[PDB]
Amino acid sequence: PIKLDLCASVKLTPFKPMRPPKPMQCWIHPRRANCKVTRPRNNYSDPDNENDMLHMTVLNSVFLNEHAKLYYRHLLRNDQAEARKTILNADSVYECMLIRPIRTEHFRSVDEAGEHNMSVLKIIIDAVIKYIGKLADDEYILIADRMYVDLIYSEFRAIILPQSAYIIKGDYAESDSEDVCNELEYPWKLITANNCIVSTDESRQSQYIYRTFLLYNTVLTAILKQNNPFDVIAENTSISIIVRNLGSCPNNKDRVKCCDLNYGGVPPGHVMCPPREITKKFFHYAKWVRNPNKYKRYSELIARQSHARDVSQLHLLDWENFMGEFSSYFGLHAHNV
Amino acid sequence: KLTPFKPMRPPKPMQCWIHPRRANCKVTRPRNNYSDPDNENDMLHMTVLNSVFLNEHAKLYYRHLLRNDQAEARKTILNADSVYECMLIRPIRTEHFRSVDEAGEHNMSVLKIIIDAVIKYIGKLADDEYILIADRMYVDLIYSEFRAIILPQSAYIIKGDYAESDSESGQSVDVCNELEYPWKLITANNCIVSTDESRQSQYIYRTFLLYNTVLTAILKQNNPFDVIAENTSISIIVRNLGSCPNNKDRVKCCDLNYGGVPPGHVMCPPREITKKFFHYAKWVRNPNKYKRYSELIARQSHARDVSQLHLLDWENFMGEFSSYFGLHAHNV
Amino acid sequence: KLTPFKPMRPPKPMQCWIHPRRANCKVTRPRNNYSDPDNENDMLHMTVLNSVFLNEHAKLYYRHLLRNDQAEARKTILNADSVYECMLIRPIRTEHFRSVDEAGEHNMSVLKIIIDAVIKYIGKLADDEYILIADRMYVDLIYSEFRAIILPQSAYIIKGDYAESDSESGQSVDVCNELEYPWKLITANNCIVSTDESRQSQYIYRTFLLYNTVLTAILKQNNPFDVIAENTSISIIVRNLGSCPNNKDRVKCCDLNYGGVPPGHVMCPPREITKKFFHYAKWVRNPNKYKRYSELIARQSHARDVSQLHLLDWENFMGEFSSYFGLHAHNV
Amino acid sequence: PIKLDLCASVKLTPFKPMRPPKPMQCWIHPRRANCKVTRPRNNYSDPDNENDMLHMTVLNSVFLNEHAKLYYRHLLRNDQAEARKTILNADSVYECMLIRPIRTEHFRSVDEAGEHNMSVLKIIIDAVIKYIGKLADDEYILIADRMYVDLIYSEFRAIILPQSAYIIKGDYAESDSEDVCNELEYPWKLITANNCIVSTDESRQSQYIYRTFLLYNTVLTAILKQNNPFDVIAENTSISIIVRNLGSCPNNKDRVKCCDLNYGGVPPGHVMCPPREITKKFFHYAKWVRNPNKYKRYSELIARQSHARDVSQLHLLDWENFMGEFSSYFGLHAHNV
C-alpha cells in the first residue's frame, strides 16, 4: 500500500524485484524462518569447495542506513565470514553469507549452546567484543532484534550474523568545541544532516553498559543449554515479572537468581548473577528500540538518576564491579572499554 | 509495529520556484563563497520520492538511464523509506533552466534539443526490458534556452526473456540471473517473458510518453494526457476532446493552447492507439499481474487487420511528427 | 479501534465529465422513462466530502447559504464519516452547465450573472460570522450559457461577538447560545470575539475569493491563486509573477491567458493585499487558534498609515472591478 | 488528522463546534465519564420544575446513521424520557435527556441494582422488550457498547438510554419475491443503496437469540447487586475463561453457575443459569461489533451449525426452552417474539 502526494493517491502494488526462496529454512537456525542455510553445488571436481556454507537471512529494509547500507556492517571489520552482501527486495531484505569452513570446521548457532568449552566461549566473546569495539563513544546503538547478538561458531571461528539494530549518532558539543552530523558535501549539507541527538556523559555510560549487558546475555546464551529468556524483547514481557519468576541471587539478594540456570557443562555458580535493578534499567533502556528517534526517553536511561542520584551512581558502580569480576573470570582486558 | 527510524533531518522547506505546484520538488541555491559568482550561479534541487523505486542493488530505477549526464550531480540519499535525489546544477551566467510543465515553448530549436535528450535517454532501454512510469504519462525534466536537464522519474524497470528458434545468435548474456555464481545459485532477479508484441506495446508507450512531454513543453495550458490517476479514463477524455477534423481517426488537439504558435492538426494522434495506450498504462497498478497488460496494445483479441492497421496509424503519427521537427525516422 | 460501519454502498464510479480532474466530483444522468426527453435532460452529480463539515445540527456548513436554490435538488447523505451532497439538475433543452475551472468564458453577460449569483450567495453571511474555505481559494460552481448552479463547498462557519458601547441598539438576538432553554443551560455553540478589524479581514477575504472565481471562469489557463496547499507561499508566487507595469503596487496578471479577450491590467490586484490575504487564508489549518489570524489582514502590528492605505488600495481594486463589469459599488 | 484528496493532503484540525462541558460527571452514573447528569435552574417560582432531570451522554459520531440520525432512536417509540435530541461536536457526540420525574419519582441506573422488587424489574423488562420489538425480523442489530442495554429506572418508569449500536439491514430475497435496500428517490437510488447483506433463516434466529440474551443480561444486571461481568465485551476477555472461572450450573452441567451469584434481594436459584455453549456462540456472534460490514462471519453465527447440525439445532431448542421457562418465571408473553 503505497501512494503518491499528487491529486490522486494511487495504490501501488509492492513490486517484487527478487524471487523469494520458497524453501526458506536454516538447519543451523531451525526456529528461525528468516534464517536460511544452504550448501552450493560447487564444481564437483574439487571436494574442497563442498565445505562452502551459504546462509541468507531475511529482515526488513528499514535497517539500511541513509546510504542504503545495513547498520551492523558499519560495526563490521576484519570479518570472518568468507563474504557478505545485502539483498533488497521490496520492504523485505536478505543477506547471504559465504563461508568456507576448513576441511573439519563445523559452525553452529550460538543459541541454546550450553557449551562449557571456555576456549570456544572465549573465541566468541573476543569476536563480539572486537566487533562492538568499532562503536564510537559518542555514537550509540540499539538492537531491535533481541537483547543480544546472533552468531554461529565453529571450533576455528565465531561468525557474526546480521542484526536488526539502529545506529544513532549523538553529539556532545563540548564546551571546548576545539565526526559531525553535517558530513555531506557542502551543497548537500545545506539541506540536511544526520538525525542526530544530544550526547552527554550519562548517554555514553548508558550505551556502554547496554553493550556490556548484550555481551553478558550472549555469554549466557552460549553457556545456557536451555532457553535464555533474557533475549526476549516481547512487548508483553516485563523484566519485573521475569525476575519475580526467576527470583534473586541466593548468594546475595542484590543480584539475580542466575545460579540455578541450566548449563551445557559445568555450572559456574552465582557468577552469572548480575545486580537486578541495573538489569531493570537496562530493559527500560532497551525499550528505546521501538521509537529510536525520541532519544530523550532512553538515551541516558541506564545512567539516569532515579538520594536517588546517589543510589543510581552506587548501583552502576556495583555493576562495574560485576564487569570487573566477569573479566577476571575470563582473563579479559578493558582496552575495548 | 516499529518506528521507521529516520537517519537524517527531514528537509521541511519544500520550496521549488521551478515546480511549486508539487509536494516533493524542492530547489535551492548555495550560499557558498560569493567571490565566485558562478558558485552562486549553482542550483541545488532535491526531490522526495519513495524508496520502493530502489532495485535489488539499492539503485533508483530511472538512474539506469542517467548516461552522459548533462547536469552536474545526481546522488541518492534516504531518510528511512523516504528517498531524496539531490541535484547539483550550474548554468552559464545567462543560462537558466525551467519546468517542462506547460512551458509554452515557442523556440523550435530548444524543443528539438530537449526531445533529442529525452529520446536518447529512453533509447538505452533493452528490447526485452519494459519501463513503467509511476507519476505521470510524460517524462519530467527542465530546460534552459541552451541545454536541458532531465529530472528524476519514479518508474519501475522489468526484464523479459524469449525463446526464439535462433536462441543463440547475438548477445544473449543479458539474462535475469544477474547475481554472482553462488548468489545466483540462491536466488534470481524477478523476470517475465518478453515477446515481439509486448515490445510493440512498449514502443508505442515510450513514443507517446515522448509526445506527451513535447505537448507539455509547448503547451500554454495543462496536459490532460499526463495524469496517471485512477478515475481518469481515456474514454471520458476522448469524449471531451473528440475526433480531429481533417482526420477523424485522430484527436482534436488542433484547438489546444500552446505558448508556441498552434500547429493545429500536427499534434493530433489516432484514437484507438491512445485508447490502448491508456489501458497499457493503467497496468502499473499491479505489475506483478504482468501478463494482464504485457501485450495489451498489440493484442489480437479480423482483429489481425485492426491491430496491424492501428500499428500503421501509430507509426504514421511517429514519422509525420519526426519529419515535422526534422527528426530522422531512424531515431527510434 | 472499531470498524467505521458503512450504512450504504460506496459509489465506486467516480466519473464526472464536468470535473474529471478531481477525486470526489461524480456527475451522472438518469435512465428513467424516456418518453419524457426532459427527464433524460436531468443530470445528477454527487460529490464526496468529509462529515467534519456537518455542524452541531448535523448540517453541511455551506448549505447555510443555499438560498433561492436555482438548482433542482441538494440533499445530504453519508456513509459513516464519508458524506455525499447529491444534486438534481434539469437544464432546458439547449441549456448545459459547465465547470468554472478554467472556463475561459468570453461572454461578458454570463460572467455577470455568475458573479451576481456568487456575491449574493456569500452576502447572507453575518457580520460577526466568518467563513473559511477548506478546498481552494475560490468558490466552486458550474454555469450554463443562461443560468449558473453553485457547487458544494467545503468550508467552516464561525460566529463572533463584540461588546460595543451601544450593545443594545439593533438586532442582538443572534448570539452563540443557539440551543433551547435547558439545552443551552447545558452547553453553548463554539464562538469567538468579532471586531471591526477582523470584519475587514473577512471582507477582503470574500472579495478576493470572488476575484479568484472570476479569474478561474475567464481563464484559459489554471488559476495559481486558487491553491490552499501548505508549501504554496504567496511570496514565491509573487516572485514568479511580479509587479504590474502600469501600477507596480498591483501584480502582472495582464500577461495571463484568458479564454475571453485579455483585459490586461484590469485583473491586477495590489501586492501586500494579496500577501495578507494569503496569510489570513493559511489560518484554516487550525481555526481553534482563531486569534492567531482573526485580525491578520487589517492588523496594526506608521503601521496605521500602512494598513489603512492597504485597505484603500483594496477598495480601489473592488470599485474598479465593479465598474469594469457594471456592478454597483453598493453590492458589498 | 483530516486530509483532502487534492495534490496536497492538508492536515485539518478537528473543529470544535461546541464547548465540551468541563464538569463531566453523572452521579447516577459515577463510573461513566461520558455519562453526565444535571438539574437545571428552572424558574424558581415553580417548585414543580425542580424535579426536571437532565442527562447528557457522550459517544462517537459513527453511531449516527446515513441520515445523521442515531440508531437506537430508530428503535425508540412511545419514549418515556420527557424529551431527547442529538448533539454533534466533531467526532465526539452528546445526547441530552430531559426528564420530569413526578413529585416523588426517583430514577436510578440499572447497573448493579440487585433489586428483587420484581414489580420494578418487570417494568424494566417491559420497557426493553417493547423497545427491541421495533426491530424487524429481516433487520438486525449489534451493541458495541456492551452485552446489554443501559437504562435508568424509577418506581414509576424505566427510562432507556442511548446505546452504541449499529443497524444492519439484511435482505432475504424470498424465492416468491412477490423495506428495500434502495429506498432513496429514484435518481439517488441510481447511485447507491443501503449497505445491506444477505438475510436468511439462520441470521434471523441469531439476531433473535442475541436480543434475547441482551434481555437476560439486563435482567441479571438488575438483580445483581455485584458486578455483572457478562456486559464486558473486552477484547482480551474470552467467554471460555469466564465460564471456566464461574463454572457450570451445579443443578445441571448444561447451564452456567449463575445460581451462586450475588443478588440484591431474594436469590432466584439456578433460574439465572443459561446453557453454556449457547452463551459461547452468543459471544462469538457479539464479536461482530468490531467489523459490522463483514457479515458473513457473524450474521448466522448463533444459528450456525458447528451431527454438528443436529447438536446446534438441539441446543438452540434447549435455549428456547430456557426462554420459555424464563417467560413463565415472570408471566410474560412471546407476542413480542
Residue numbers in the entry:
A (entry chain B), D (entry chain B): 7 to 184, 190 to 317, 335 to 365
B (entry chain A), C (entry chain A): 17 to 317, 335 to 365
What is written in the article reporting this PDB entry?
Baculoviruses have their large circular dsDNA genome packaged into an enveloped rod-shaped nucleocapsid. The BV nucleocapsid structure consists of three parts, a central helical sheath containing the viral genome, an apical cap and a basal structure attached to both extremities of the helical sheath. Herein, we report high-resolution cryo-electron microscopy (cryo-EM) structures of the BV nucleocapsid combined with de novo modeling and Alphafold predictions.
The innermost and lowest portion of the apical cap was identified as having C2 symmetry. First and intriguingly, the peripheral part is composed again of Ac101/Ac144 modular assemblies, as in the apical and basal anchor-2 rings, and in the C7 plug. While all the four protomers use Arg255 and Arg308 for dsDNA interactions, only protomer-1 also involves N-terminal residues, Arg45 and Arg47.
